[PDB]
Amino acid sequence: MYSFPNSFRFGWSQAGFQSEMGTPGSEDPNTDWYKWVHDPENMAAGLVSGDLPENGPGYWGNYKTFHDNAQKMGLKIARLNVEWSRIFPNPLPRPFDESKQDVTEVEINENELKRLDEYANKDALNHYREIFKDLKSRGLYFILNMYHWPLPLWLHDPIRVRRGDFTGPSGWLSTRTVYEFARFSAYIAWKFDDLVDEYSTMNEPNVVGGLGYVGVKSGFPPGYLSFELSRRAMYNIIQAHARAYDGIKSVSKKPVGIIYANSSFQPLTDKDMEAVEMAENDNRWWFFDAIIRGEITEKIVRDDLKGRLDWIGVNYYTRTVVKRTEKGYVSLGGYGHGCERNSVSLAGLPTSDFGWEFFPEGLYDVLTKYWNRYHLYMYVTENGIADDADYQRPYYLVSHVYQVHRAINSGADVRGYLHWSLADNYEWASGFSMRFGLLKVDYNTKRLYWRPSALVYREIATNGAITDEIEHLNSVPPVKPLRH
Amino acid sequence: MYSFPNSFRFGWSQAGFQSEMGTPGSEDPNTDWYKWVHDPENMAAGLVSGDLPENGPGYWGNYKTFHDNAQKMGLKIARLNVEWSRIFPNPLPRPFDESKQDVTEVEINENELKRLDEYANKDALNHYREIFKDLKSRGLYFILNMYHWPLPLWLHDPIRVRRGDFTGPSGWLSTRTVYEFARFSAYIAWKFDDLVDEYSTMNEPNVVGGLGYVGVKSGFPPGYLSFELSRRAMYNIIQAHARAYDGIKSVSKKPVGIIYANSSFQPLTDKDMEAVEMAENDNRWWFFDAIIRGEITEKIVRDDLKGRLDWIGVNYYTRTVVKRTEKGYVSLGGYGHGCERNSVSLAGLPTSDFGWEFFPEGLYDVLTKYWNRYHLYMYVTENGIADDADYQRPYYLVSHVYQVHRAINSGADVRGYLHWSLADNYEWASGFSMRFGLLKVDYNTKRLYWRPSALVYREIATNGAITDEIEHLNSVPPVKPLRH
Amino acid sequence: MYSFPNSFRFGWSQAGFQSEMGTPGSEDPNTDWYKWVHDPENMAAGLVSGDLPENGPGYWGNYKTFHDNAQKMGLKIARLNVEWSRIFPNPLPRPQNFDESKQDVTEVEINENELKRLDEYANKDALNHYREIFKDLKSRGLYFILNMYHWPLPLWLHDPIRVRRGDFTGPSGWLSTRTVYEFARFSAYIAWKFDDLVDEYSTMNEPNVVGGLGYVGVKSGFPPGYLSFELSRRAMYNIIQAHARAYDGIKSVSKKPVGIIYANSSFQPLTDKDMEAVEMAENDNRWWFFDAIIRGEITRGNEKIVRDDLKGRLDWIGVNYYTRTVVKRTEKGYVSLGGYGHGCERNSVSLAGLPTSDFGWEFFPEGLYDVLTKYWNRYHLYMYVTENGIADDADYQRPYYLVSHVYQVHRAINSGADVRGYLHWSLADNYEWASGFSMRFGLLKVDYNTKRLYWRPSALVYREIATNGAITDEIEHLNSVPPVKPLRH
Amino acid sequence: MYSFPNSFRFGWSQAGFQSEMGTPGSEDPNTDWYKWVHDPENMAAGLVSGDLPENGPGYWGNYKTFHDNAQKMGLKIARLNVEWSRIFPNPLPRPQNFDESKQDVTEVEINENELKRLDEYANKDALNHYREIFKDLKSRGLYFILNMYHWPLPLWLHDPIRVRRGDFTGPSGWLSTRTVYEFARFSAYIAWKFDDLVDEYSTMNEPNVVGGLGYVGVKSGFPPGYLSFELSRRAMYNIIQAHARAYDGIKSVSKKPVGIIYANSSFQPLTDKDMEAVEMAENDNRWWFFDAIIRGEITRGNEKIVRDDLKGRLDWIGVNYYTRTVVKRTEKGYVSLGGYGHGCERNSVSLAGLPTSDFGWEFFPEGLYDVLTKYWNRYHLYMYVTENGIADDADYQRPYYLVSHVYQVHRAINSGADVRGYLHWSLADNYEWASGFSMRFGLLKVDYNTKRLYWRPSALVYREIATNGAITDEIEHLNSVPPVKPLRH
Ligand SMILES: *[C@H]1O[C@H](CO)[C@H](O)[C@H](O)[C@H]1F
Ligand SMILES: *[C@H]1O[C@H](CO)[C@H](O)[C@H](O)[C@H]1F
Ligand SMILES: *[C@H]1O[C@H](CO)[C@H](O)[C@H](O)[C@H]1F
Ligand SMILES: *[C@H]1O[C@H](CO)[C@H](O)[C@H](O)[C@H]1F
């Protein structure tokens, strides 16, 4: 048996854009992401799959079923987001000097919030309140995230930017987005504080800037390849996090965190340990040192950035193998996320439907490194596998949950594990083919089915432990019967 | 939902030789099969794996744990056998003309049973009583089978026979074995009737004669290749069944059946339907027409054979594809049981760790054909898959259970489904590598673990139905992620 | 036995950029493609592999060895290009009598005086080196098809990074009529200089891939990688008129045959209800182009016109072929299906159970017969198979790939098609564009460390074919699908 | 370049039973093997495949075509056997001065008079046909190694079904000294008849496989398939004395070199603690046999003796080699491991990640060097590589298999070993015993419907090797492991 503390919670995470649509009446056409996946040129180029999110799992209409299943599964925590575009589908009056690089302060008060109130979509706010009330009535502890990638179209036209036209709404390249984000977050906290337990400002901001402006083959908006603009987007996102933090704290006393995409960086040979550290600096610490210690880049300390974080949401799937170079370090293909789909890595480890390598030890690595650097408590806010057949998921689930136990045992303050995800959903540029659910979705009927891994998770959650009977699943899925 | 009748029972089947040994004190060295798998020449030839049954799962010592798990799984029926060799390890006095071909009668009465009593091993009888009492106390309905392949060494020395020496104890080639089998079965019924619900005389007698004397590459005792001796063994086994039936009925009023190995015979092309019928005649009907209608081979009717059956135990794994020949019919490799391990058949269907093709429709075929010919009620007494990883079993389980539902819906009287098996066990000449358990066995510690399929079976059994939530598993395991 | 006419030639095709560099002093940094593959942002995005052409097979210095092996192998035809950038590495003077705002280029006047001026700007070392290569070529008895263009443009004509970034103020490649004007002049110039060595001309290699991958299929990492339906059409329009202007230019200086080389797939119906889908696909991917440069039929804005300056500008068709495309009828028209043709997994099997190559291309030789006979029946121009081959480092499938496709050409001739040679892609491994060196198409293996060439068993098979002018009885079993059971699925 | 001595020969080996039948009038129903493979019970048990040798490649009638192709391929040596059963299809008179109960056969007197008597019983059509085959062989410049025995015994000497059934009252094959006596006479007889055509002799092909698979490895479906450690030893004991008696018999009539051909694997240690395990394996599978027939050392019942009638009966060693065997130390001795060598899955990869053949045999060329040099250092007798090859219908791995093993022979010579030729198994596909026709080892493919031979690309590779007496620079990259990524795992 591997027993968790009595206060530890098991649950799940999901995103508005990936899961909301699918039931008639749920359509939200007003985001950069909506426009982006319907774009004819993006489709012809294969940058997006051609699948459309309005044919999704339909959480907007069917949330009661989702919560029903989650309760039967013994889950006690959930992390969701509100979609910005649903609440403010229409542009807000211009507020503020747009040419200033830094946004050190955004003044928000009772009067300003009441003014915003008059622009807000009331049907959308009331519907979210209905969803969250039903969530809370199942005994689910609620982490509310403000941002999980789609921006209102009135703040970002991604096709214009893709085309190299910077005269329109430019998303994270514009301090106007920073300013409005802080206000949105204060506003939502103001409206929903009575239901919320903890807050997250944003989900994986590193992926937004990284795939948006460098990893353009990913088909993420706006898909404009520029090292310079990628840095600008990340700089603005950092400030937006700090201002959203201050905004929420002006209205609520509850914990405010952030959710971030992590890999476990691993040395190719024992000569590559420095390369691991440089990779950790460049992919992780630089960002967290900014919003925790105020350290940013000349290398300065910004007092408006310092201390703006109460907890860390750890998202984790797999490792990245690095080696030392003359000029620095490189990542290696054939490991981590750079493998063949439904095959084996260069290390002989099985890969998912998405080509991601099975490497649960990485999670222990990531949890304990954060803990040793910052001493902030953590949730595992995302962890899971693309696996429609359910072959690897039982092993994936138990192995990762074990590593969390390992992390706690070593002293790290980790307070919950939230699987990605409760049900299948729309996997961004990849469409519906990448199925991460504990529950399978038949997209024709929106009916949910329990994969055997869901029954395994029920065992874990109901008992607050990896029980004796399922302990063998803390191992690598046998590769011999699997595709190579 | 697929709901079964309120009286339908879900459970499991297991064999004494495959599951009993493994705990110190359980060793039974006195069978043909024990001798056969320890034989140095058999080992060097690769006819047996080299694995030894005394290193098994240890049901003899650990039966309470097995039954505990079965109860938690919601099972309500079990079929086991007593091992003949445990009860009579030593030769019994010669009774009876050994050169007579037919055994039409074996006289058994109270006095003869008391005489046998004085030869019986009392420790073994008392231990079995303890096992079965504990079984019944979990609310398990009990089918007791008399014979599941091992014969006492004093009735069969398989190495002598393998060597072409017929002067020793010759197993099913000798009417002495028939005579003693009838007495053993009456004796066991006499001892255990208060605990037993239904009886089976024997398990898969067709496999005993077929692999014993024709399919000699299987490594079944005595491994002497002879069409003639295979017929002789089957003739004696048939008579032994009829005499065991009469023996049990002299002592008990309870239902007496038999458990038999079935394939579903399928035509290669639509020109091969007659070939299917000939295959069914040669592999199935000839045997059942003997013990039900007394029809045997000149083609006669034996009154001592007629009507000796109350129910049919249907064992089923996969299909056999046949085609018409000039001289008759042939079976095709690349389908059914003749496939590559962990691969796909010639029809693109996934195969097991044993190379057996996924074909659940065959079970409906087999159930309804028996029903339409004889109108005897049936149990599915064996059905399962060699699958250590648990990749295919959830699908295999739900799909086959569905076909049973299909059979009932069409009118067939089927009263239970017994999965092969509750836990991993010693798979004959193949050893421990073929793992059929709903529970995984760690052979070092004898600890049992729940594979995700066990949690799926708990759903089925507790509800008496394939529930809505697991209904997607009534499909073929996706082949793309699997080895080809 | 499958015998070819006595005049039919077996050989190979090769491209300057893919094969020239690798030997000391061979480097040509002055193309869009060179800049494109060295670009740090393109590298970080994985648009390009990170392999660099300057570490290539070194034909620039080792051409005598290549030619030696090709002669040993009994080859009798070769098709090569001159790299524009090596001849004119620096810009030429903005031309007289030229309006950059005019959509159409109906004429480009080139005379002996203009040619003599151009000659002042040409790199003489490059010109002399190419003469040395081609002389050596002809000395082995190889018939020579000289192609003018095989993708890289001089940087002074195209800065692809600028265009990638959405900046159209600089040199914009096929988006500019200046490039059309200069291409015409370049082709006339090369013909004027090399006509004593050339047997037949091609203007261009696969223009449809340049426009298509450059401006629509941007995940392929082709320059300038700017996603735009509108700009893809403009590039294709300009490339069409460039072909016509180049044909006139070559004809002003030469009597020899002038063709074009084009990328083809065989369009195949998913079900028997999809035959119209195939015809629409053939219209959109093939006929529209050739009806323009043969029949002068084209669309400019919104109208279907005939341009007398485009009509009749083709003497022969270079058929490039690898695999099929499976199409199905839609409400809005037709779509291609993944899991067939070039959209399969690498080293696997297609949805039809046919083996795929290192590049994920489906084995489908019957498509070649389909393509050759369709071109024949529509236009009645003679053709060459100018590119056919497989990415196969291990040499598992190539022996089958080669014999089978060569059989399909024999079948095409038998049906009446005028097909005059077969040219394998390629003699030796080379630099496969954005994919780098890992895609190995050679009959000969290249060790990139030593630049040594090795005969794959397929090269020995090809020698049998070429020396005999036939698929001989002894190798005829190779006219079949590589067995799939021993291969990866 | 890897060059061989000017006297080294490249060729092939072939067996009568596997290759002769298939043409009208070639049938030879009079062997244990023939009866064994037609047996209904053996068929139903799947001990034999159900394929029949009379539908084979037809060397009996088509030998001129085989020889034609072998000469085209530049081969210069061949090793064939005569089938005993074709020469003596009927029993011979029970012999004078012979006690069937004696364990040892120390002498078999054969003189000219006895030979002339035997000649009265020999089938003359068979003898003349073999002369015609061998004359044609020699006329292509092939050096001829004639082997006396390659597994089938005349039925009058062995009824395998009777023995399978445990009935030892009939003709019992290698379990009877009568078979030893007759083999000696047969070999002297064949030498007496064919010595003008023969260059070197072998008595036997792989006697260890006959005894081993016949009496222990019974799942292999070899005759008589009677499982007995004791009878395997008796068969091997008799086969050893048969070899000695045959050597004396041949020497009574011929001056030429007389050797034996033997099945070898390379024993390899699982871990570095297993080197003694390897030596014990080499003792039990190899040295015990050769110490008997070279040094006269043997065990009879319970004692280690020297027999002067066994000592020195060998002039050369025929090395047969396919793959390795991995062994590990046990308390009781040593064991072989599955997942390496010949115990792998077909068309897959071994536990060491090395590719396996259609037969499930692991690619391990370094084992050949190990085997050749071990024999050399122990006995200092010259050797031939008499069997080496791969079951590979598609020809994917064979080009690598061939070049790599041929390299390992070059390495053996370089180290000092006297190795005088390499003979591929085999020229053409044939009947692979209990496996039937599906295991295809030919450099040439056989279509069993027409009996036509086809050159696999490996045959072209072999022609390069043989005509040059070298692995040439051009094919030297084949001295490597077939890439596993494109193959089935
Ligand atoms: C984390 O990863 C999952 C699986 O890829 C989804 O993309 C989420 O939105 C992301 F936050
Ligand atoms: C039925 O089959 C199973 C799986 O092979 C076991 O062998 C049983 O003993 C047999 F009855
Ligand atoms: C045709 O295809 C080959 C191999 O893909 C090369 O890319 C050539 O340049 C192209 F023209
Ligand atoms: C050596 O092996 C080959 C291929 O396995 C044939 O079986 C020969 O007869 C044998 F001697």
PDB file of N, CA, C and O in Angstrom, chain C residues 24-25 34 76 133 146 167 172 180 212 231 290 432 454 474 484:
ATOM      1  N   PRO C  24      36.105  20.382 -51.184  1.00  0.00           N
ATOM      2  CA  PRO C  24      36.707  21.695 -50.912  1.00  0.00           C
ATOM      3  C   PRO C  24      36.530  22.649 -52.089  1.00  0.00           C
ATOM      4  O   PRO C  24      36.838  22.264 -53.215  1.00  0.00           O
ATOM      5  N   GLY C  25      35.998  23.846 -51.851  1.00  0.00           N
ATOM      6  CA  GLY C  25      35.879  24.845 -52.896  1.00  0.00           C
ATOM      7  C   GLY C  25      34.616  24.769 -53.717  1.00  0.00           C
ATOM      8  O   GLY C  25      34.476  25.522 -54.667  1.00  0.00           O
ATOM      9  N   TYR C  34      20.024  27.909 -49.775  1.00  0.00           N
ATOM     10  CA  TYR C  34      21.184  27.859 -48.892  1.00  0.00           C
ATOM     11  C   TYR C  34      20.873  28.646 -47.629  1.00  0.00           C
ATOM     12  O   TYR C  34      21.130  28.175 -46.511  1.00  0.00           O
ATOM     13  N   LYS C  76      23.033   5.459 -70.276  1.00  0.00           N
ATOM     14  CA  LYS C  76      23.225   6.084 -71.589  1.00  0.00           C
ATOM     15  C   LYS C  76      22.542   7.457 -71.690  1.00  0.00           C
ATOM     16  O   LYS C  76      22.525   8.075 -72.754  1.00  0.00           O
ATOM     17  N   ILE C 133      32.628  19.315 -66.508  1.00  0.00           N
ATOM     18  CA  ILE C 133      31.705  18.252 -66.084  1.00  0.00           C
ATOM     19  C   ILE C 133      30.956  17.651 -67.290  1.00  0.00           C
ATOM     20  O   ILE C 133      30.981  16.430 -67.485  1.00  0.00           O
ATOM     21  N   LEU C 146      19.753  18.902 -70.459  1.00  0.00           N
ATOM     22  CA  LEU C 146      20.135  19.985 -69.557  1.00  0.00           C
ATOM     23  C   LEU C 146      18.905  20.715 -69.103  1.00  0.00           C
ATOM     24  O   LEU C 146      18.131  21.180 -69.918  1.00  0.00           O
ATOM     25  N   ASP C 167       7.347  40.258 -45.139  1.00  0.00           N
ATOM     26  CA  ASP C 167       7.925  41.508 -45.649  1.00  0.00           C
ATOM     27  C   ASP C 167       8.099  41.372 -47.156  1.00  0.00           C
ATOM     28  O   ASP C 167       8.975  40.642 -47.627  1.00  0.00           O
ATOM     29  N   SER C 172      11.570  38.982 -54.064  1.00  0.00           N
ATOM     30  CA  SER C 172      10.418  38.163 -53.708  1.00  0.00           C
ATOM     31  C   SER C 172      10.226  36.897 -54.572  1.00  0.00           C
ATOM     32  O   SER C 172       9.148  36.308 -54.555  1.00  0.00           O
ATOM     33  N   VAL C 180      10.838  36.401 -63.629  1.00  0.00           N
ATOM     34  CA  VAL C 180      10.432  35.824 -64.911  1.00  0.00           C
ATOM     35  C   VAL C 180      11.349  36.331 -66.036  1.00  0.00           C
ATOM     36  O   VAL C 180      11.843  35.568 -66.885  1.00  0.00           O
ATOM     37  N   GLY C 212       3.455  25.102 -54.805  1.00  0.00           N
ATOM     38  CA  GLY C 212       2.639  24.369 -53.839  1.00  0.00           C
ATOM     39  C   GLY C 212       3.221  24.272 -52.428  1.00  0.00           C
ATOM     40  O   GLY C 212       2.571  24.683 -51.468  1.00  0.00           O
ATOM     41  N   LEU C 231      -1.003  34.032 -53.009  1.00  0.00           N
ATOM     42  CA  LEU C 231       0.395  34.092 -53.477  1.00  0.00           C
ATOM     43  C   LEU C 231       0.872  32.808 -54.170  1.00  0.00           C
ATOM     44  O   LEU C 231       1.755  32.861 -55.039  1.00  0.00           O
ATOM     45  N   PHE C 290      -0.644  22.129 -67.975  1.00  0.00           N
ATOM     46  CA  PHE C 290      -0.184  21.784 -69.305  1.00  0.00           C
ATOM     47  C   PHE C 290      -1.076  22.349 -70.408  1.00  0.00           C
ATOM     48  O   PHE C 290      -0.590  22.678 -71.480  1.00  0.00           O
ATOM     49  N   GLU C 432      18.409  15.777 -49.337  1.00  0.00           N
ATOM     50  CA  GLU C 432      16.978  15.785 -49.662  1.00  0.00           C
ATOM     51  C   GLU C 432      16.292  16.998 -49.027  1.00  0.00           C
ATOM     52  O   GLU C 432      15.471  16.883 -48.139  1.00  0.00           O
ATOM     53  N   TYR C 454      29.277   3.492 -53.063  1.00  0.00           N
ATOM     54  CA  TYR C 454      29.173   2.030 -52.916  1.00  0.00           C
ATOM     55  C   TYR C 454      27.980   1.551 -53.746  1.00  0.00           C
ATOM     56  O   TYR C 454      26.981   2.259 -53.826  1.00  0.00           O
ATOM     57  N   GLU C 474      16.068 -13.426 -65.981  1.00  0.00           N
ATOM     58  CA  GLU C 474      16.623 -13.763 -64.684  1.00  0.00           C
ATOM     59  C   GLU C 474      16.168 -12.860 -63.516  1.00  0.00           C
ATOM     60  O   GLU C 474      16.247 -13.273 -62.344  1.00  0.00           O
ATOM     61  N   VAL C 484       5.675  -8.094 -47.628  1.00  0.00           N
ATOM     62  CA  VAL C 484       5.441  -7.264 -46.446  1.00  0.00           C
ATOM     63  C   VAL C 484       5.687  -7.973 -45.113  1.00  0.00           C
ATOM     64  O   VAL C 484       6.073  -7.338 -44.148  1.00  0.00           O
TER      65      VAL C 484
END
